[PDB]
Design a binder for this molecule. Structure first.
Ligand SMILES: [Mg+2]
Ligand SMILES: [Mg+2]
Ligand SMILES: [Mg+2]
Ligand SMILES: [Mg+2]
Ligand SMILES: [Mg+2]
Ligand SMILES: [Mg+2]
Ligand SMILES: [Mg+2]
Ligand SMILES: [Mg+2]
Ligand SMILES: [Mg+2]
Ligand SMILES: [Mg+2]
Ligand SMILES: [Mg+2]
Ligand SMILES: [Mg+2]
Ligand SMILES: [Mg+2]
Ligand SMILES: [Mg+2]
Ligand SMILES: [Zn+2]
Ligand SMILES: [Zn+2]
Lengths: 162, 38, 108, 155, 43, 177
RNA sequence: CGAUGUUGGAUCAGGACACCCAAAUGGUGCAACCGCUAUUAAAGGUUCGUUUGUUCAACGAUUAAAGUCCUACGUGAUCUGAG
């Protein structure tokens, strides 16, 4: 991995690019002929929002996702992983992947509401005051439709709207 | 801002951004091109 | 050893099939609570009303405990003590009192 | 090997005993139950039996009411042939779906051959002037289960 | 608040009651039975 | 088994106190099992007319979790009766005002709609945190399992498990995060 | 149809928002004052008089404004009977 360091001395600035050792891929993938990382490690339709050990492999230290041209994923797997990362960040998983602000960490606010499988942004949803009757019912989306193809051991389809 | 059902860019400087759950045509050169998806 | 259900709660199930195959037998001896899974009985004995001058008066003080309350607060106390609602303790009229069976049937 | 949430099934993995050891253990258990029966160490037996279209869980000195008349006189003894289940404080024998006549024997004495209380059956139709009233008096029989015996012929 | 004009099931505007997976499975089972029947009625 | 009639009756129909930790648990999944215990549908001696019903003590009520955006989408509507007195409060606002309210309403809704609902609701004790009076604490018998398995956050993971999990891809050395 | 008593007005108003005023903003062929549109918001207000039975309508004087409707064209076991 590459880092940029800045040095200031006597109104003179020097920026340097330092390369440190980075982890490499594990020696034995179960499906070596796959052209895609997830699809060759046999994790397709196998991860969820709570699999942080996989979701944190490729995200920036401040929580941002990594570009597809760098990660190597196929488009659908990239979208699924991006949605899973968003859901984990909203649920509260990955607590060390946030920027550090000492000035803003002191003014504590109201306690965070526990949540999980959150599809939309918490600040963009309006409360459903009407809620409809049985024939026209306003359903609350839960989870994401991108993960509707995950393996279901019980056989019951996931309730994405409830 | 004009609230519309279909958003279209009226120049080359209009950019489409998703905010507050809606889609927006924001324009800086021509502020009259501000459109909000209903 | 094998058992479909744990053998920790009150019986030890051992299933088997007869050689003919037409009968399923099962031996389920009861299980006693081990001595290490119990606690000693707590003893509550305190006589704080005893007096060194008059034991008869000491006994009278401990035996003459009385209290009276109105229907409202009394029913509230009963409901709080038995974890019920106040509506259970209110009486009923003659029409409902006289229609109760004087000699209800008894089984066993 | 990756360990994700959906990579493994969400139930404990079950391993079953080898068939020959299972058969040997079954033989041992059957022998122990048979020796208990032969020694007669069981205190009291209950039995689930099939009689007159219903299944009854009866013990000794028991009373049952059957909603139909039987072709016997009062005070006659009757062997209940269909016994589905037998049980005691220690062991329990199940049928597939029935037990053996030589294995279990249940006797019941006929007590009373009577008729039931008058049951009302009324059909009524709104604003159609259709009312129909009927009285049902179903014959009934009372059986006293006396004894439940089990034999050591359990292979 | 969400009234259904007229009766629920007869008018031009009816109740939008949907089709369930149980209903689909029942219809599929009936179709399989009828296919077997029309096979047996062939020769 | 050879009990006398009265002690056998007392043992059979005795009331039991159950504990339930509500930390990071869905209020609906808490309320379903709490209502089952309150009604007594877990007893083979259960009957509608009998008063068979056990006490349920739910702790960590303030730390419940709603799946999805229910915190901002689910609303609770009340009416004071007076004209213009219809209030619709968001789930988050109701939780901030009263932590007990969300699970209390869930259990009240899941309970049967007869007159016994109030009586068996009087047997439900809800505590915002793990601060239970000793009188209630000494009555507890067993703690029911939490209906939802709470996932562990990344820093809670063991280093052994972190290194055991494979690296599915090899980032380039020249890339800068 | 073995009766669901009508317009208008008086008294009291409940509600909706498709907001007239009051509040926060976007665009203007928005220089400022006046304006024209659109977004969000319904806790509170929304006049007194001449003619007409009038709802409407014209006119006079003002107001921050003198909103559109639903309520058995709200309300006659509360009132009037001008039509
Ligand atoms: Mg209708
Ligand atoms: Mg219709
Ligand atoms: Mg008429
Ligand atoms: Mg009449
Ligand atoms: Mg009003
Ligand atoms: Mg509006
Ligand atoms: Mg204004
Ligand atoms: Mg108003
Ligand atoms: Mg009209
Ligand atoms: Mg009227
Ligand atoms: Mg009236
Ligand atoms: Mg009138
Ligand atoms: Mg009058
Ligand atoms: Mg006249
Ligand atoms: Zn792929
Ligand atoms: Zn533009």
């Amino acid at each position: 991995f590459r880092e940029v360091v800045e040095i200031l001395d006597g109104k003179t600035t020097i920026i340097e690019g330092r390369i440190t050792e980075t982890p490499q891929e594990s020696p034995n993938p179960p499906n070596p002929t796959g052209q895609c990382p997830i699809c060759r490690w046999n994790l397709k339709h196998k991860y969820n929002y709570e699999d942080v050990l996989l979701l944190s492999q490729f995200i920036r230290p401040h929580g941002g996702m990594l570009p597809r041209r760098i990660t190597g994923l196929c488009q659908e797997e990239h979208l699924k992983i991006e949605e899973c990362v968003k859901m984990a960040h909203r649920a509260g998983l990955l607590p060390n992947h946030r920027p550090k602000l000492p000035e803003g960490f002191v003014p504590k606010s109201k306690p965070r509401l526990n949540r999980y499988l959150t599809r939309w942004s918490p600040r963009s949803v309006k409360p459903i005051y009407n809620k409809g009757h049985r024939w026209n019912k306003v359903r609350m989306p839960v989870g994401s439709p991108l993960l509707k193809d995950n393996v279901s051991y019980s056989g019951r389809p996931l309730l994405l709207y409830h | 801002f004009k609230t519309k059902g279909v958003l279209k860019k009226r120049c080359r400087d209009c950019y489409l951004v998703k905010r507050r759950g809606r889609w927006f045509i924001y324009c800086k050169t021509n502020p009259k091109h501000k459109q909000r998806q209903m | 050893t094998y058992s479909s259900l744990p053998d920790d709660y009150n019986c030890k199930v051992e299933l088997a099939l007869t050689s003919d195959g037409r009968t399923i037998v099962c031996y389920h001896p009861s299980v006693d609570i081990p001595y290490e899974h119990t606690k000693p009985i707590p003893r509550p004995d305190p006589v704080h009303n005893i007096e060194e001058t008059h034991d008869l008066v000491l006994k009278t003080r401990l035996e003459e405990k009385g209290e009276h309350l109105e229907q409202g607060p009394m029913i509230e106390q009963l409901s709080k003590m038995f974890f019920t609602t106040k509506h259970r303790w209110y009486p009923r009229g003659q029409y409902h009192r006289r229609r109760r069976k004087p000699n209800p049937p008894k089984d066993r | 090997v990756p360990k994700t949430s959906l990579g493994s099934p969400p139930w404990p993995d079950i391993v079953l005993p080898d068939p020959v050891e299972e058969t040997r253990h079954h033989a041992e258990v059957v022998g122990q139950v048979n020796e208990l029966i032969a020694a007669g160490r069981y205190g009291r037996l209950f039995a689930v039996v099939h009689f007159a279209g219903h299944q009854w869980k009866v013990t000794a000195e028991d009373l049952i009411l059957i909603e139909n008349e039987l072709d016997v006189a009062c005070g006659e003894r009757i062997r209940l042939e269909k016994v589905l289940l037998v049980g005691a404080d220690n062991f329990t024998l199940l049928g597939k779906p029935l037990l053996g006549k030589e294995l279990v024997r249940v006797e019941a004495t006929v007590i009373e051959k009577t008729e039931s209380w008058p049951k009302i059956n009324m059909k009524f139709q709104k604003r159609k002037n259709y009312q129909r009233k009927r009285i049902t008096v179903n014959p009934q029989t009372v059986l006293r289960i006396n004894s439940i015996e089990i034999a050591p012929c359990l292979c | 608040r969400n009234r259904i004009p007229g009766r629920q099931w007869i008018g031009k505007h009816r109740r939008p009651r949907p089709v369930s997976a149980q209903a689909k499975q029942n219809m599929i089972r009936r179709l399989e039975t009828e296919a077997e029947n029309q096979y047996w009625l062939s020769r | 088994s050879s009990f006398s009639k009265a002690p056998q009756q007392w043992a059979t129909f005795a009331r039991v106190w159950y504990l339930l930790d509500g930390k990071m648990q869905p209020p609906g999944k808490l309320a379903a099992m709490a209502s089952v215990k309150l009604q007594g549908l877990h007893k083979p001696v259960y009957h509608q007319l009998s008063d068979c019903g056990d006490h349920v003590v739910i702790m960590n009520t303030r730390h419940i979790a709603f799946s999805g955006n229910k915190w901002e989408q689910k609303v609770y509507s009340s009416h004071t009766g007076y004209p213009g007195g219809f209030r619709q409060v968001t789930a988050a606002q109701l939780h901030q005002k009263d932590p007990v309210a969300i699970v209390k309403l869930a259990i009240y809704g899941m309970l049967p709609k007869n007159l016994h609902r109030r009586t068996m609701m009087q047997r439900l004790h809800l505590f915002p945190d793990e601060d239970i009076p000793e009188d209630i604490l000494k009555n507890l018998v067993e703690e029911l399992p939490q209906p939802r398995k709470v996932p562990r956050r990344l820093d809670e993971y063991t280093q052994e498990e972190i290194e055991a999990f494979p690296r599915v891809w090899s980032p380039p050395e020249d890339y800068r995060l």
